[PDB]
């Protein structure tokens, strides 16, 4: 059972029959036989951890499956190819997946289309570093989730969209996304819990407004002092709003140092907080 040998015989049968070979009936199965062959090949390719070859093999069995009329099990093959290349050392992980969604989409399977769609936007960012397309996918994907009643997942993607949107200067578009995901979270008193952080992020995101977009966003926020979750959202914000409205790059830089105690500041927060820390000095020196 030689790999490259299978890759050869598979080619020997993947072709419209003719002459005495064609005989009486065609070969809608020949193409299928070839698919099974290439699959058998990619198997041992994945064995020796040669992934690359395994992936390129699955691409073959998959492409062939289409030339047979079987989009379903075909697309699944494209997925196997994607998982291979992904874990592998070469690229192609992006092509196989695109070629997978076009199928899960045309067929009528959006649940799964979005399942691979998020994986896609996740690779097009952590790898190719192509946020301008990643966001597009995170969004269209969240749309599909939001149509499968799947609310949570939809928000999972939206957070990605706004999250990386504010890290690209799209501060306003970000707060807007946070407002939407914030409204579609209160309907479920089981989400009341996370609907805070959204207000924190949205109030932090600033499109260089001169009004009190944040002092207003923090106001819209219903909070009660005795509350706990809430003390981890607006409480800090107010103090930051005062430190900004008073061009004091000390009270803000120290309040962010204190909050960093009760609540550890992740990467995002950090980057943005620093952007505001510079808007203060910049306003002092404008």
């Amino acid at each position: 059972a030689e790999a490259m040998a299978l890759l050869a015989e598979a080619e020997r049968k993947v072709k419209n029959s003719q002459s005495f070979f064609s005989g009486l009936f065609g070969g809608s199965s020949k193409i299928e036989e070839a698919c099974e062959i290439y699959a058998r090949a990619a198997n041992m390719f994945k064995m020796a951890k040669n992934w690359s070859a395994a992936g390129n093999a699955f691409c073959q069995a998959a492409q062939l499956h289409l030339q047979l009329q079987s989009k379903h099990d075909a697309a699944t093959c494209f997925v196997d190819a994607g998982n291979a290349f992904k874990k592998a050392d070469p690229q192609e992980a992006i092509n196989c997946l695109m070629r997978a969604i076009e199928i899960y989409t045309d067929m009528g399977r959006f649940t799964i289309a979005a399942k691979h769609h998020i994986s896609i936007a996740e690779i097009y960012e952590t790898e190719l570093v192509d946020v301008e397309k990643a966001i597009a996918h995170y969004e269209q994907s969240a749309d599909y989730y939001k149509g499968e009643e799947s609310n949570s997942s939809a928000n999972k993607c939206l957070l990605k969209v706004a999250g990386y949107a504010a890290q690209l200067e799209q501060y306003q578009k970000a707060i807007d996304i946070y407002e939407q995901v914030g409204t579609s979270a209160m309907d479920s008193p089981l989400l009341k819990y996370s609907a805070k952080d959204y207000f924190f992020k949205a109030a932090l995101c600033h499109f260089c407004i001169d009004m009190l977009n944040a002092k207003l966003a923090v106001q819209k926020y219903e909070e009660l002092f005795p509350a706990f979750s809430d003390s981890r959202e607006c409480k800090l914000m107010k103090k930051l709003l005062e430190a900004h409205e008073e061009q004091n790059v000390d009270s803000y830089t120290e309040s962010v140092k204190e909050y960093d105690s009760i609540s550890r500041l992740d990467q995002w927060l950090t980057t943005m907080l620093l952007r505001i820390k510079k808007t203060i000095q910049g306003d002092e020196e404008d």
Binding site: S70, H72, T76, V79, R109, T111, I112, K115
Partner: protein
């Protein structure tokens, strides 16, 4: 007094419990995530069998 300096670990111990609780559940997510792509894809083939078995019915029955 001492209860303060003591009870401190009464939670640091739980902080570990959830650390595993958060992981356990997440481990199921991937087990169900893959099962979601093999189970749904499974019936997908069943659809091909439903159509094939339906036709074998309008010819031999």
């Amino acid at each position: 007094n001492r209860r303060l300096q003591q009870t401190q670990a009464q939670v640091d111990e739980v902080v570990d419990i959830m650390r595993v609780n958060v992981d356990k559940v997440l481990e199921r997510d991937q087990k169900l995530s893959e099962l979601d792509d093999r189970a749904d894809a499974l019936q997908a083939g069943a659809s091909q069998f439903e159509t094939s078995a339906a036709k074998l019915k309008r010819k031999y029955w």
